[PDB]
């Protein structure tokens, strides 16, 4: 189906403990494929997926340069942001950036992204038109005016419509064994007595790729949204994900409850019941 490529970047200042730490990772869909950490012994962009290992030394040289340059501009940006918010130089602050593109099954661009956050809060974002900006406050309006004067959006649009889509296409082909394989969830229901009067029914989805999934409980065919405990989808460590949804069920009611599972690896949604 559709696919995405994203690059994530975090700089965190640490006054009195050296210069800010810079960490960036790249993903295609839910697969990590490159990383770079300024605190590494000899910082370089490193591969994290087999299908990117085949890029030659020119790639790794260029990528490493880009990462180092971004570490440097972020340190200047952190100094800038202290002035914009009238802040002391005493404290730790955080600068985050994400950009990338989504394509449809035909490889064409569905939308691009480029957006920043300071201290955990939205700061400035490129709008879906790839030509105008949403600034969160009057400080980000100062950045907005500078980026409008410099025609930054035009530079980002050219990347997002061109190189971004073209790299994602190359990666999807070179990594077609995995990037284009959906692993369906392995599912079962467990039963956990709480007292004489009620027990937990837990519906499991294990070993699935990609991470997107829907897990729901119904009672007599009605959604139990407010009475379901739904854990956050979590990484297994083997590229796959896990999730469960649990409801508290009065004694003797178990067969009135059904668990419903949707996943792109499933050709039809599943319905499951507790099987004693």
């Amino acid at each position: 189906g559709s696919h995405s490529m994203r690059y994530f970047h975090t700089s965190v200042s640490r006054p009195g403990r050296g210069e800010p730490r810079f960490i960036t990772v790249g993903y295609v869909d839910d697969t990590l494929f490159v990383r770079f950490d300024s605190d590494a012994a000899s910082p370089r962009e490193e591969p994290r997926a087999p299908w990117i290992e085949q890029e030659g030394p020119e790639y790794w040289d260029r990528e490493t340069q880009i990462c180092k340059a971004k570490a440097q501009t972020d340190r200047e940006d952190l100094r800038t942001l202290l002035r914009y918010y009238n802040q002391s130089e005493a404290g730790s602050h955080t600068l985050q950036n994400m950009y990338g593109c989504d394509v449809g099954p035909d490889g064409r661009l569905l939308r691009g992204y480029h957006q920043d956050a300071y201290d955990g809060k939205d700061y400035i974002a490129l709008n879906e038109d790839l030509s105008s900006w949403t600034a969160a406050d009057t400080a980000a309006q100062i950045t907005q005016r500078k980026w409008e004067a410099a025609r930054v959006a035009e530079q980002l649009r050219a990347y997002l419509e061109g190189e971004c889509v073209e790299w994602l296409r190359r990666y999807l082909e070179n990594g077609k064994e995995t990037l284009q394989r959906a692993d369906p969830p392995k599912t079962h229901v467990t039963h956990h007595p709480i007292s004489d009067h009620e027990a937990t029914l837990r519906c499991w989805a294990l070993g699935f790729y990609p991470a997107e999934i829907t897990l729901t409980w119904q009672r007599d065919g009605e959604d139990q949204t407010q009475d379901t405990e739904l854990v956050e989808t979590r990484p297994a460590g083997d590229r796959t994900f896990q999730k469960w949804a649990a409801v508290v069920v009065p004694s003797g009611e178990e067969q009135r409850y059904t668990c419903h599972v949707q996943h792109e690896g499933l050709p039809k949604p599943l319905t499951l019941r507790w099987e004693p």
Partner: peptide, 9 residues
Amino acid sequence: GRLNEPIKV
């Protein structure tokens, strides 16, 4: 492959 445009706030 990454964006190679330097951009300062």
